[PDB]
Symmetry: C2
Subunit: 132 residues, 2 copies
């Protein structure tokens, strides 16, 4: 069982300097928004899967863009009642390969997404922009 550890310390009003393996970032009221950071965690975790799978499937990737939009409940806790994720692969990428990468990620490999999936409505979409 892999162990991950992070440590936070107050940096400014309701803001924390957050220590991770690659460095420290400020998260909170006067720093990176925590809920926006959750979307970043989801997007990057899944993006890593998609990148590796597309590569394994011999696709020529020039760029991968991921757009996440979350809609929050109005009462506490204000969790995301809905999260929309759109994957855009740019390059010589076949729609079938992108679809397989997105499904494998969202249904089997993405650890972050797997943890919040049971508490929100997930809407996933993707598209390829064929470019040389």
């Amino acid at each position: 069982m892999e162990v991950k550890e992070v440590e936070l310390e107050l940096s400014s009003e309701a803001t924390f300097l957050s220590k991770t393996s690659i460095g420290e970032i400020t998260a909170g009221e006067k720093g990176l928004n925590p809920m926006e950071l959750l979307l970043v965690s989801i997007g990057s975790c899944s993006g890593v899967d998609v990148y590796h799978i597309l590569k394994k499937k011999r696709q020529e990737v020039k760029d991968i863009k991921i757009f996440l939009k979350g809609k929050r409940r109005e009462k506490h806790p204000k969790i995301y009642e809905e999260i929309e994720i759109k994957y855009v692969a740019v390059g010589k990428v076949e729609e079938k390969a992108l679809e397989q990468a997105v499904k494998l990620s969202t249904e089997k490999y993405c650890s972050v997404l797997a943890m919040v999936k049971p508490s929100t409505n997930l809407k996933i979409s993707w598209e390829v922009k064929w470019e040389e």
Copy 2:
């Protein structure tokens, strides 16, 4: 319903420049680890609640340190089977006030934590270091 949006773009091998409201950070294989970022999101979201509550309860806070440790499953998806969170309030803070702040956050206000709670075993602890 508040809407949060973030956009990611490939920056390096399996890494993404992630655009948020305060700026851009690199998340992925060669940047901030996605699962570590999830812990940062949880810690900072809750930390914001604790800060505000302690302030409301008239506590004199010199510092707030939050330690998160996550243990991952060995098979995919490698979600955190357990997440330990330790809150340390430093200053003229009464243990009773910290306890109330931690419980209100973890049980009602923390949006990020509320979303992953149903998929993991949460172990919460706290302590005060009385300092002038």
